[PDB]
Design a protein around this ligand. Sequence first.
Ligand SMILES: Nc1ncnc2c1ncn2[C@@H]1O[C@H](COP(=O)(O)OP(=O)(O)OP(=O)(O)O)[C@@H](O)[C@H]1O
Ligand SMILES: Nc1ncnc2c1ncn2[C@@H]1O[C@H](COP(=O)(O)OP(=O)(O)OP(=O)(O)O)[C@@H](O)[C@H]1O
Ligand SMILES: Nc1ncnc2c1ncn2[C@@H]1O[C@H](COP(=O)(O)OP(=O)(O)OP(=O)(O)O)[C@@H](O)[C@H]1O
Ligand SMILES: Nc1ncnc2c1ncn2[C@@H]1O[C@H](COP(=O)(O)OP(=O)(O)O)[C@@H](O)[C@H]1O
Ligand SMILES: [Mg+2]
Ligand SMILES: [Mg+2]
Lengths: 345, 318, 316, 297, 461
Amino acid sequence: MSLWVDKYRPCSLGRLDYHKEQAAQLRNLVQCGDFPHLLVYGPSGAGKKTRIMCILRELYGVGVEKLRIEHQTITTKIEISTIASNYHLEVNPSDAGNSDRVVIQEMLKTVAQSQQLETNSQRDFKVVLLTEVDKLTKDAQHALRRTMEKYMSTCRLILCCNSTSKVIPPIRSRCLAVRVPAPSIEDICHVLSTVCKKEGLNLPSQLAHRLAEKSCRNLRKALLMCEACRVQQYPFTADQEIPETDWEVYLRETANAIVSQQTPQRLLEVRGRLYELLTHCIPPEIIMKGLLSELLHNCDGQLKGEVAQMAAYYEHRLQLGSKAIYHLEAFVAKFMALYKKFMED
Amino acid sequence: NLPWVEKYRPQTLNDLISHQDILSTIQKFINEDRLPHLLLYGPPGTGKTSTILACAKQLYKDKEFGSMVLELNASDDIDIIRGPILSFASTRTIFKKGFKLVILDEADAMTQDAQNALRRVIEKFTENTRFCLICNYLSKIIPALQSRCTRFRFGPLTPELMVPRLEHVVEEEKVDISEDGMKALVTLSSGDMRRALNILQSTNMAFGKVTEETVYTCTGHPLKSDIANILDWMLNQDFTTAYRNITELKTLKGLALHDILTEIHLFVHRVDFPSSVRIHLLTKMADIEYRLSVGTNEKIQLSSLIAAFQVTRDLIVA
Amino acid sequence: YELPWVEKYRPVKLNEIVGNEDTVSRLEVFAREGNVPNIIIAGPPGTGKTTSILCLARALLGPALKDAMLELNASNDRGIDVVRNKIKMFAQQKVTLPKGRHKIIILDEADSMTDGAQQALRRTMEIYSKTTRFALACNASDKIIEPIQSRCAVLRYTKLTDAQILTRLMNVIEKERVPYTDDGLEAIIFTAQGDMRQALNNLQSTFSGFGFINSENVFKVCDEPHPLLVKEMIQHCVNANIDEAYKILAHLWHLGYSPEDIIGNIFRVCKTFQMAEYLKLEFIKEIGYTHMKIAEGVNSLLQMAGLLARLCQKTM
Amino acid sequence: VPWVEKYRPFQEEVVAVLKKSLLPNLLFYGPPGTGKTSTILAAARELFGPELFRLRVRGIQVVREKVKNFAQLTVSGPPFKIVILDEADSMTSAAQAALRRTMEKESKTTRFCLICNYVSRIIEPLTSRCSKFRFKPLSDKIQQQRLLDIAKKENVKISDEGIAYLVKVSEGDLRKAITFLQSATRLTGGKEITEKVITDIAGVIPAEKIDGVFAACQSGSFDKLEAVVKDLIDEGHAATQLVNQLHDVVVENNLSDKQKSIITEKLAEVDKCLADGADEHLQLISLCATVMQQLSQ
Amino acid sequence: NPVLRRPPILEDYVHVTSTEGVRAYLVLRALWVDEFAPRHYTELLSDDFTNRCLLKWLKLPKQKVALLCGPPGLGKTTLAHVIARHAGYSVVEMNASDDRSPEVFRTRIEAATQMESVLGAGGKPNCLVIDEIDGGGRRRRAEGGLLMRPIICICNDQFAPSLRQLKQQAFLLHFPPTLPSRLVQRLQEVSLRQGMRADPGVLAALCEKTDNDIRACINTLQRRGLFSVWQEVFQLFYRVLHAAASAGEHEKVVQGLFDNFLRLRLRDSSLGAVCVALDWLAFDDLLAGAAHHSQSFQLLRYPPFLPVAFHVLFASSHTPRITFPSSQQEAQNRMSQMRNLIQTLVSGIAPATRSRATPQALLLDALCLLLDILAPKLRPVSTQLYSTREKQQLASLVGTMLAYSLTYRQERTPDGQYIYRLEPNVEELCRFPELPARKPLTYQTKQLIAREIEVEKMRRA
Ligand SMILES: Nc1ncnc2c1ncn2[C@@H]1O[C@H](COP(=O)(O)OP(=O)(O)OP(=O)(O)O)[C@@H](O)[C@H]1O
Ligand SMILES: Nc1ncnc2c1ncn2[C@@H]1O[C@H](COP(=O)(O)OP(=O)(O)OP(=O)(O)O)[C@@H](O)[C@H]1O
Ligand SMILES: Nc1ncnc2c1ncn2[C@@H]1O[C@H](COP(=O)(O)OP(=O)(O)OP(=O)(O)O)[C@@H](O)[C@H]1O
Ligand SMILES: Nc1ncnc2c1ncn2[C@@H]1O[C@H](COP(=O)(O)OP(=O)(O)O)[C@@H](O)[C@H]1O
Ligand SMILES: [Mg+2]
Ligand SMILES: [Mg+2]
């Protein structure tokens, strides 16, 4: 109850701060009978978990908040850790590797059997919550939709994913999509001010704007950064030195190094920087996006399109391949070649 | 009644067609006892299994045929290799003398380790057991495994050597067939006799008459006139109206972009394009056909095909 | 009846193996000294790994080969229990041998056993090494676990040069007095792809089918996309003559060859085609990508046409 | 209870030819709402009578072995039993090949009537070995009247233009508009179903966003494209939906043939990349950069 | 040209028109090791920190299980045997040669642990060794909490997820490489038994020829040739030699090519060459992926071209100093270490009824967590009002780190100086080098934070 991110997370749908129309629609849906399966999706740090928790809060009693550690094993044997409550179970099946399909099937079997054990004080079904559904494999998703058809009456499924690109159409065709857009700059300003005010502090509007734009409309980022700048210096000023995560700075410095000198020795140094980046388990797509974003700040206007197309093409190749560094290295080399050609002409 | 594919399956060596050299070679091997292990491969439905069954029944009478020929299919599955196959190959005959025979249908489905085990079994008992391996792709066979047997390639049936066989069925199964109906039946078969018989039976069931339009509708294959119209639209009409016409035709007749794309491929090589234009078109159409396999949106791919053609118009006119 | 030429003329001594000469000499040295360590043989199929191992074991054990040698193949069961029960008990089995001799366990197709079987085989190899030696053989060295290779003398084999193939084939010809011609020898060598077993089998089949050995009969029995036509294919691709390349491709396709065979033979021709090294590497990479597309299901004639087009545009 | 199963139903002719067989394997495809399962069930009931029941069929080995257990059984005597295997296109390629093999060695006793979405299901039983049948989707007008009736009986407060929008977002098939309407009335509480609610439910991007994207592309400043793509991604719209809607817009504008061709080819490449799971933001950025390069000349 | 202004007179055609409508027409057509094994403590070699520190723990400071780490060649197999010989204890050793069922595990270990010896009282204590650890894990952890006699399991990494569950109750030693300082002499007295004469320089060369491997140096009284292909490709038809002589292992050749081509200095504006080389590397990656996705052995005839591809592109005169590739292996093992640290961190936080954020999101956003615990360095002394209102201060930080199970604990470097490092040690997981390094918290402040954590743990009844 210490961090602002969790302390000020609303409990019920009615006390939300943004997308209140969607909150009202969800309240109407849960209020009426025949609760269907949900496919909640949106950018990270938008509130998908908060919205789903409020949906559970409206669907069941306040006891849903009393989560419990659960550990389960599957046949092949693989043991995984799960989070559940006395009305629902939450699991990220993707952490079980390519054996995700069997763990999904077994967990759904167990939940379906257990719900019949007088787990009907308020609703005639349990909720199976899956996070990062986009990381599931295609056969795993087929098994997921098959089991969802199998045990629709006795349990309900709620899916959370950052994007719907990797979700099979059969799953999307049978789940109710709930799009949760990232909150606007003004919404982030108000929620930051509301947290700042309820904590007994004062947030100037310009600082709130700087936080919102720097947070890239990720509310968790905004709250962390606001608390960090508060503990750094309470008397906020317009020129407050707002800190940011180290890996973002390292990626920016890597892009600056790429821009500075287009030589193979510099290329090897950038490769070392990329090893450092991948080591900390940041996804390759995040690295590619950040590298492109910082590169465009230096490229001429007539050159940005080629760089963007090259970045997209090499990221796609990386998705096809298995060795991340090969394609990232190729994109860096191609950018250095083009930038060297254009600066020297 | 009984489907015509097996109702008129060949039963003797004379019933087979277009493979008379291969049949003669296998007959010579049988008569001179030099019969080696046989590797038969080719496009599906060219009579390989029927050929080997005919040869075996020629060599073996039905009284002992069951006890001296072990027919098996690979897709029914490594335990097959170490089980029934090894047991059969590890003993001599029951009643007659001479080498036994094992026929492995769909041999290309076996895994590489299973193929190595089969190779070891074959080399162990090559003296008294002969293996016939039947597969569609030769490349699916381990190079060591295919180095123990003679390879025979059963090519697709050319029309004029497969037309008479269909005519016998038409005389038997009383169905009126036109000249263009027969030609379209041959064309869609593409050297596959099983495909020809199945298409003939489905057309007869659907309408009782066999004609080019009837068979094309029954199989769903686009007509040559439709392909010519699509090509003319892409080459002449502007992008919007060409897209509208092609989409309307496709949704009206239920055409598939794969068959469409193959037919415009054939037409592109048929027509006289400039070399660079033809190269560009081929590169594009290959790219689109790749895109369909992964399961993309078909409308966008169709418009991309139109785009590939629409660019050339200014280039071709100049 | 007569034995297949791949067995009727199987070498019986290490002196008559035309494979990698240095490894053969090393095996002869091991046979003379006696105390051979655990050896692992990897390389292309049919280069003589099995023959070399059998000849080594026969030389070492001599008359004791009947009961001092244990051989397992993919045809046998090499499961986790068999290596735990048959291999272990055989290793413990008491056999009296001369001072330089050891019990030899031969596991041909060593790449075929699972991870667990090899993990169990590790310790049994380690414990009884004082009196038992292992002679593994496989086509892919990566399949056998790293500790096994660490506690063995890995012996690489390579595709035999065309000279060695020609010498062995001419020896067999002298043995059989089979009529021949230089074109037939070149064709049989090309079909061999460095594989003695493949070459001997193809030569025997060709002689059986037609007697006199010439390129025509060799390609008749060993039916394949004819290398010459593929040579004009690639030559036309170099000259950017897309139409002639398509003509050859359509002729081959109408002949009924599967696209996989056509693309494999195209790449094989691109091995020795006399043409610029950088452009050859470009062609090889493009053929590799097209073979990716073919192997993953997209095997239409349009794909081969696109290959021809892209090869034409590589030269611009 | 879902309303789709409640009211799920032209092609009664194919039943007669099935009863005339007194038998190539049946293959039924088309939009899922065309009543294919109901059609085959009615045909089986008519052919075999009330007293003869039949199996209906997620694994491949289990399916094929169950096929052996059934087809291996004798029948009282009508001679051939026809196996269903609906959702055939959902089966993997290896599963479909194994099912193709299972179709053989059982054709002497049983037959098969597969149900799938057409070309998605693999070739060798699709070509030969099966008698294909296409099930045409209902006309847009008839679907409009049907949804109007559904709204009236289920007292759903939706206007006729709302019904037209709903049947539009359910392109070419039924039972998608029905479930969309049910979800919409349950989310709205039945008070009113506006067109924006349907747009959100179906995942359609509002046309104003597409207009803004095109305006940013026409502007000629890469910063505007970056900002608009960032905003569009922040809204959570799937890149596939943006590609589809922008494709529909482009193909019927007044752009030059060369411009339209280049934009559509880039759209196809982007769609292929998204099919492989590439990053949405990068693909959208590249597509918008191409659109700029075409529109800025 | 094939384009026709007007339709052909006597052959079929198809017409094509431009955007304007200009229109055109186209034709349509139709032994020794046991003998010289150590006997007592006097036969140990110098520069070893394992045998000199295992004896202190294995005397009767209360650890239950042991572990093996570090590179091989340190004599860890004979370590416990020699320790037991010196102490007079008995020895028991096993492996995977027997079927390793959990019930079989119970049978093999319960007897060895809980039973005395049928002998005099001197030899009754026993020592146990487990070999080839990679169902058995739950069995070894089951009795590991309540056994008496320590058991050694053979392994090399201390960061394995299964091993750290037993590692917390282990008195691990340091594993320094064993220097050849006394190896040469030890081989020298061995030569007296052999009777064969080897020069001291030749003996030192043999020690260096085998990387000071005693197991091989003893047998010497009777490497890897991957550098050859690298010399063939990087320095000077020519290419046909490569394809006919690159017949070795493959993936390590690829790693060496990837790690070495940038070090070579043929030319500085070779960005085209490095782009082509990277294209070839990506092609190899795609080949490796596809040849496994589709079981087509015919597809892997191409990867042998990758060494040839680097040739011609990077062929030149003698110049580069080719090194063995480790960058990819270093990256892989460091990836595994960071992922294991991630699981270790998340296992005590996210399941604990709190922290509703995915581990990946937490990973990318864990830097501000450290910044939120910067704390004021004023050194508060009074038991009340620690330099600011405690509710909006250090108490909140302690609650936060208790929710995340973060603590500061005593560390001592081999230099002998007191160090405080956060117990989960997430700074290595979050922070990066080559950036402005923020000043860390003081030693006194970490004392302070640790003691509020300790008191808060008991406060939360
Ligand atoms: N040469 C032929 N002459 C006559 N009928 C043929 C011929 N080839 C095939 N058929 C017909 O096609 C049917 C299928 O043939 P069969 O299965 O034996 O061919 P195959 O080439 O071995 O193919 P597959 O590998 O698919 O089994 C036969 O039962 C027969 O009706
Ligand atoms: N160097 C050689 N000289 C002569 N004949 C050879 C040689 N190598 C192979 N052969 C011939 O090829 C046959 C097969 O060889 P062998 O069984 O040893 O193959 P291998 O290389 O171990 O392959 P695999 O494990 O794939 O079967 C031999 O019996 C012999 O007739
Ligand atoms: N301190 C030492 N004193 C004497 N001999 C030693 C010493 N350390 C190692 N050796 C010798 O080195 C060899 C290593 O034997 P051992 O099996 O114990 O090694 P290990 O390092 O545990 O094994 P591995 O390298 O396979 O992981 C033996 O011959 C052993 O006698
Ligand atoms: N209406 C709101 N009022 C206050 N805070 C909110 C609101 N919505 C979201 N948040 C905060 O934003 C954070 C977003 O976290 P999460 O739900 O994981 O985002 P997502 O699920 O979209 O990735 C939550 O921790 C929550 O504290
Ligand atoms: Mg057949
Ligand atoms: Mg061999």
